[PDB]
C-alpha cells in the first residue's frame, strides 16, 4: 500500500545547506540561516533559560500527565506577556501548542471547525509554511499586497484595497511584528486603519506573533496585537517562544482565542482542548515550564529581558552599519530601508539572477527571494555584502 | 464565528482524573506504594548529563534525531531491524504516532477502513471518528472467560480486505489486560498475509507485560512475516516521561524505494502539523538507550516495576479467592499489563465510587498499579459488597 504514496518535496533549506557546505571557497558567507547566531556564529542557550532548567532539574518530582491544554502558569504568563494589562481572562481561551507552527495549524482547524466555508488571506509575500499548511488542509487562500519591491516598504494602499474584499467569516493572517521574510512593518497608525477595515468586513484576524522582542522591544512589538485585541471582539493569536527564548527545538508556543463573551470562551476552550487530544493528546511540557519559570521568577525574568535587549540592540546596530556602508558606497540613500526594517530578516529586493550572481561572484549565500539574516552579519562581512550588492546592480 | 462551535465530548478516563479514603484506579499511569509516579533513576541522570552537554537549542531534525530513531528501532524490533526498508518518524507521544499513522495510510489509500478490537483504547476510535474514517471492530474480549475470543477474532479478520488496516495492541491490551500468545500471533500473521491488510501496532507498554524482549515478540513476528507494517511506539510509560510527549512511528516497507517515499511523507506530515517534533524526551530516551550504565539501570528499574505489579495481581486474586470462597476472579492473575477489566456493570461501578471513594473506569477497568497491601483487601471487600 505505501508504494502508492506520492513523493513529497524536501525542505529546501537542506538543499541550500548542501550547496553552501560543498562550496570550496574559504571566504563564503551564509545569510540564508533562519535562526539567531551571535558574533561567533553560534545559537546559544539564553542564561535565564539555562537557569530554569537547573531549577526544574532540582524541583520536579514527577513527569505524569499534566494539563491537556497546558498548565495554568504558562497560559497566564503568556497571555500577560502578549496582552499585558489588557488580558481579559473571562473571555480569553488559551492552548499550549507544539511551537507557534502548531498554534497556527490549530487556529486554522478551529476556525474551519466554526466556519466550513473559511477563506484565508495571507500577505504577499509571507512565511512559506503558512501557505503550505493551508494547501495541505485544502483551504482556499487569497493574497493581499504587502511588500513594495521598489521601496522595500509596505504597500499600504494595496493592502487596504485588497483586504476590502474580505467577507464576514473570512480569516486575515497578520504578522504581529518583524515580518518574515520582508522585514517591512506596519506602524501603529496603519494598524488602526487595518482595525477599521476588519471591523467593517467582519473578518477574523489571525495574528502570527513569533518575534516579540526583536523589533523595538517586548511592549512595542505587542502594540499592534494589543490594538487589534482591544478593538476587534474575536481574535486568534499564535505565539512562538522559539526565538525570543531561544528554545527552538523544545517546541513551545500557544494559541490565544479572544472571544466576545464568557459563554463563547468556554466553547472555544473546549474545542481547543479537543483539538490537542485528536492530534497528540497532551502538549510538550519542558519548554513551557522553562518559559513560565523565567516569566514568574523576578530574577530570571529580569535577566532574560536584559539578554533579549542586548540581542535586539546588537542587530539594530548591524542594520545601521550595513546601511551606513551601503550609503557610503552607493552615494545615495537608496538602501536606507535596511535601517528601517525590524526583525532579523530583510528582503533586499534582488532578482533571482542578482541573487545567483552575488553567490557565484562574491561567495555570499541567501534565500532565493533575497532574504538575508541580519544576525549573520558582522564587522568583517558587512563591507563585503555592501560591495556585492552595489556590484551586481541592485 | 467562534460562537458556532458545538460543545465537544470530554474524555472519560481523564474525566475521572479530574473527579478524584479516595482510591484512584483510573488513568493508566504507574504509581508506587505511596501513590507517586516517580521519575526513573536513569531518566534523571540523563537530564543532568544533558544539562551539562547541550550547547544549543536551534532547530534539529524534522523527523527526529538519528540517535533516537536508531535506538527506538533497535528497542522494538531488536535484530530484526532492517534500516534500508524502515522509515522512522519522531512524534509527539504514542498518540501523535497513531494520528500520524492514520494520516500516512490514508494518504496511500483514501478508501481505507480500520478494524479495531472489541474493546479498545477509546482514543483510537475518537481520532478515527474525527478523521472521518470507517471503523469496523473485531471480536477480541470474551466476556465469559475474561480471556480472548480468538475464534471470533480470526473470523472477523478474514473478512478484511487488502487496503484495510488492522489495529493491534503489541502487548498489555488496554483496557482488558487480555493478550495473545505467540502461537496466536503466528496465526494472525497468516490471516494478515492472506487478506493483505496492513497491521498498525500500538506498542505503548513494552516492558510491563512479561519483559522488554518478550513484550516485543509478537511485534517482531508480524514484522518478519508481513512485508509492510506500521508501529506506533510510546515512551510515556516504560521511561516514565509521560509529560515530555515522546514516541515514534516506524514504517516497515517492502523495499528501499518505498522506504524513501514513506520517510518523505512522514517528514512532510510533521512539517504540516507542528513542524519539528519535541526534543527533550527523545534526547532522554536515546541518552538512556545508548549509555550502557544508564540502560542497565533502566532495565533493572523497569523489571522491578513489572515484577511488583505481577505480585499485586497474585495478591488481589488470592484476597478475592478467600473473600468469595471461589476462583472466579482467577483471571486477574492471568491478565498481563497495567489494567484488568473486572466485569462490574455501570451501576455497580458507580456505587463503588460514590461511597467507597474508589474510582475505576466505567467499564470496570482498574489500574492494578493503583493497589497495594493496604488497599487490596479493601478493594476485594468493596466488590464483594457491591456483589452482582
Ligand atoms: C518561527 C516562526 C514561527 C514559529 O516557529 P515555531 O518554531 O513552531 O515556534 C511562526 N511564524 C513565523 C513567521 C516564524 O518565523
Ligand atoms: C499510553 C498509551 C498510548 C500512548 O500514550 P502517549 O502518552 O501518547 O505516549 C497509546 N495507546 C495506548 C493503549 C496507551 O495506553
Ligand atoms: C521547517 O519549518 C520551519 C522553517 C524555518 C523556520 C525558521 C524561520 C525561517 O527560516 O523563516 C522555522 C520552521 O518551523 C518552525
Ligand atoms: C486522553 O487521552 C489519554 C487518556 C489516557 C491516557 C493514559 C492511559 C490510559 O488510561 O488508557 C493517555 C491519554 O493520552 C495519552
From Swiss-Prot, chain B:
GO biological process terms, semicolon-separated: L-phenylalanine biosynthetic process from chorismate via phenylpyruvate
UniProt xrefs under SUPFAM superfamilies: PLP-dependent transferases (SSF53383)
Protein origin, superkingdom: Bacteria
Swiss-Prot/TrEMBL catalytic activity: an aromatic L-alpha-amino acid + 2-oxoglutarate = an aromatic oxo-acid + L-glutamate
Residues bound to substrate: 28, 59, 121, 174, 365
Keywords assigned: Amino-acid biosynthesis, Aminotransferase, Aromatic amino acid biosynthesis, Cytoplasm, Pyridoxal phosphate, Transferase
Main location: cytoplasm
Any one cellular-component term (Gene Ontology): cytosol
Modified residues (N6-(pyridoxal phosphate)lysine): 237
Transmembrane segments: none
Quaternary structure, from the entry: Homodimer.
Entry similarity comment: Belongs to the class-I pyridoxal-phosphate-dependent aminotransferase family.
Name of the protein in question: Aromatic-amino-acid aminotransferase
Amino acid at each position: 500500500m505505501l508504494g502508492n504514496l506520492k513523493p513529497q518535496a524536501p525542505d529546501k533549506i537542506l538543499a541550500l545547506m548542501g550547496e553552501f557546505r560543498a562550496d570550496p571557497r574559504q571566504g563564503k558567507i551564509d545569510l540564508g540561516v533562519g535562526v539567531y547566531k551571535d558574533a561567533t556564529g553560534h545559537t546559544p542557550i539564553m542564561r535565564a533559560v539555562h537557569a530554569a532548567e537547573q531549577r526544574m532539574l532540582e524541583t520536579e518530582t514527577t513527569k505524569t500527565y499534566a494539563g491537556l491544554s497546558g498548565e495554568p502558569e504558562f497560559q497566564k504568563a503568556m497571555g500577560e506577556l502578549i496582552l499585558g494589562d489588557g488580558l481579559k481572562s473571562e473571555t480569553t481561551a488559551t492552548l499550549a501548542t507544539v511551537g507557534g507552527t502548531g498554534a497556527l495549524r490549530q487556529a486554522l482547524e478551529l476556525a474551519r471547525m466554526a466556519n466550513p466555508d473559511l477563506r484565508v488571506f495571507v500577505s504577499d509575500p509571507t512565511w512559506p509554511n503558512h501557505v503550505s499548511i493551508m494547501n495541505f488542509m485544502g483551504l482556499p487562500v487569497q493574497t493581499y499586497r504587502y511588500f513594495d519591491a521598489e521601496t522595500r516598504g509596505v504597500d499600504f494602499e494595496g493592502m487596504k484595497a485588497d483586504l476590502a474584499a474580505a467577507k464576514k467569516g473570512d480569516m486575515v493572517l497578520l504578522h504581529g511584528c518583524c515580518h518574515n521574510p520582508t522585514g517591512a512593518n506596519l506602524t501603529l497608525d496603519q494598524w488602526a486603519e487595518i482595525a477599521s477595515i476588519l471591523e467593517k468586513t467582519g473578518a477574523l484576524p489571525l495574528i502570527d506573533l513569533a518575534y516579540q522582542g526583536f523589533g523595538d522591544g517586548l511592549e512595542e512589538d505587542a502594540a499592534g496585537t494589543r490594538l487589534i485585541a482591544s478593538r476587534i471582539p474575536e481574535v486568534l493569536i499564535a505565539a512562538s517562544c522559539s526565538k525570543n527564548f531561544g528554545i527552538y527545538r523544545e517546541r513551545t508556543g500557544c494559541l490565544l482565542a479572544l472571544c466576545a463573551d464568557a459563554a463563547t470562551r468556554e466553547l472555544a476552550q473546549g474545542a481547543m482542548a479537543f483539538l490537542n487530544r485528536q492530534t497528540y493528546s497532551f502538549p510538550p511540557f519542558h519548554g513551557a515550564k522553562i518559559v513560565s519559570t523565567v516569566l514568574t521568577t523576578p530574577e530570571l525574568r529580569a535577566d532574560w529581558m536584559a539578554e533579549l535587549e542586548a540581542v535586539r540592540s546588537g542587530m539594530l546596530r548591524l542594520r545601521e552599519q550595513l546601511a551606513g556602508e551601503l550609503r557610503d558606497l552607493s552615494g545615495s540613500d537608496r538602501f536606507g530601508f535596511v535601517a528601517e526594517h525590524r526583525g532579523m530578516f530583510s528582503r533586499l529586493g534582488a532578482t533571482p539572477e542578482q541573487v545567483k550572481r552575488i553567490k557565484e561572484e562574491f561567495g555570499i549565500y541567501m534565500v532565493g527571494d533575497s532574504r538575508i539574516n541580519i544576525a549573520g552579519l558582522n564587522d568583517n562581512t558587512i563591507p563585503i555584502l555592501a560591495r556585492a550588492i552595489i556590484e551586481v546592480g541592485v
